[PDB]
Amino acid sequence: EDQLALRADGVYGRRWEWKPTGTVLVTGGTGGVGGQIARWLARRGAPHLLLVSRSGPDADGAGELVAELEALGARTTVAACDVTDRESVRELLGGIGDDVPLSAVFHAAATLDDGTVDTLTGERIERASRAKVLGARNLHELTRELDLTAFVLFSSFASAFGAPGLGGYAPGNAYLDGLAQQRRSDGLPATAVAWGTWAGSGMAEGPVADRFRRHGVIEMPPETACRALQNALDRAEVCPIVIDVRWDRFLLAYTAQRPTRLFDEIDDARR
């Protein structure tokens, strides 16, 4: 076991209809992770949407995206706003008109350049993915007083299993998972979906994504990953992991360097 949780009751090893009614704070709404999801919300009938990326109006694909969701749903809004600052997120909610309450904060933004342990340091990890952690923390602390029907934190497989080149992208996703793990314990629903390689995004679709494509996790189509998010809100799953991993190639790409009892619970992981 590489993952141990000693408790008073023993030793534990880690082992592998919701409607968009209200406004949707799609953090990083321009970036595919929250862009294909923003389109899904609009199709599902989102009365309002709020794609908020520092880029925002200045994003390569902003106007195109906005037009798509404006046709599918209604009242879609892109906004150039920081997510790291607590007060800029308070200003976001101040700008949110009282006309529509917020119930669907879909935090999707995540910055990433490299994830190699050789240079990974506190400064690096933080500056690498501070939009993902400080952003989610601010949204949590602000919405503690909001009746959100959904607070889906968009995370990845980097905190689900190991991923070279995402070791700096992994902590942020792990903080996301922990935030939702305590949020089901309190009175505010949160869903930490560990998204595998998104088919179309570029937020984590980088050199590691194309490597893992040929040894395990393969591109999960949006036209079924959006239904996976629907069912993760139909079951109110606190922390789901949506991946299209093929264990035929994954066994010799994970347990090869380190046998891991993590995957000795999935039945078709033997091969």
UniProtKB/TrEMBL annotation:
Superkingdom, taxonomy of origin: Bacteria
Quaternary assembly: Homodimer. Erythronolide synthase is composed of EryAI, EryAII and EryAIII multimodular (2 modules) polypeptides each coding for a functional synthase subunit which participates in 2 of the six FAS-like elongation steps required for formation of the polyketide. Module 1, 2, 3, 4, 5, and 6 participating in biosynthesis steps 1, 2, 3, 4, 5, and 6, respectively.
Species lineage: Bacteria, Bacillati, Actinomycetota, Actinomycetes, Pseudonocardiales
Portion of the full sequence shown: 1635 to 1915 of 3545
Protein name stated in the entry: 6-deoxyerythronolide-B synthase
Function: Involved in the biosynthesis of antibiotic erythromycin via the biosynthesis of its aglycone precursor, 6-deoxyerythronolide B (6-dEB).
